[PDB]
Design an enzyme around this catalytic site. Structure first.
Site, PDB file in Angstrom:
ATOM      1  N   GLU A   1       5.859   6.583   2.531  1.00 34.16           N
ATOM      2  CA  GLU A   1       4.425   6.551   2.331  1.00 34.16           C
ATOM      3  C   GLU A   1       3.779   7.853   2.865  1.00 34.16           C
ATOM      4  OE1 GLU A   1       1.780   4.584   5.079  1.00 34.16           O
ATOM      5  OE2 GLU A   1       3.429   3.327   5.718  1.00 34.16           O
TER       6      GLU A   1
ATOM      7  N   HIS B   1      -5.792  -0.010   1.695  1.00 30.87           N
ATOM      8  CA  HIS B   1      -4.912  -0.194   2.821  1.00 30.87           C
ATOM      9  C   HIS B   1      -3.800  -1.207   2.573  1.00 30.87           C
ATOM     10  CE1 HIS B   1      -3.797  -0.629   7.170  1.00 30.87           C
ATOM     11  NE2 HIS B   1      -3.926   0.686   7.064  1.00 30.87           N
TER      12      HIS B   1
END
EC number: 3.1.27.-
Length: 109
Positions: free
Chosen positions: A72, A101
């Site tokens: 990520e 998120h």
């Protein structure tokens, strides 16, 4: 020259198979003085963003394949506390984005 947009980072990953040089993992950021509770990343590591950590995928929210792993990276980060935008990229070059998120993901490459 700070590449930190969804398209910028995605296209960089495809071309070079690594994140741009403005990315550091969480432990590297910590070594430089980052403390998450202080929101101080831009002050201790100007121009840097968090990225490159393993993304577990233990919940199977992203597609699974044998031998596929995921990492990520933070997107659109400028300063202060981390935001909600992330790119998640696989070892076989699938690229997903989230702007909430990690609640929802959209494939972009």
């Amino acid at each position: 020259a700070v590449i930190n947009t969804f398209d910028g980072v995605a296209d960089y990953l495809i071309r070079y198979k690594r994140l741009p040089n403005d990315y550091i993992t969480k432990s590297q950021a910590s070594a430089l003085g980052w403390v998450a509770s202080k929101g101080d990343l831009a002050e201790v590591a100007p121009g840097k963003s968090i990225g490159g950590d393993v993304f577990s995928n233990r919940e199977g929210r992203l597609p699974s394949a044998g031998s596929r792993t995921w990492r990520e990276a933070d997107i659109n980060y400028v300063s202060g506390f981390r935001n909600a935008d992330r790119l998640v990229y696989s070892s076989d070059w699938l690229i997903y984005k989230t702007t909430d998120h990690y609640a929802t993901f959209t494939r972009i490459r």
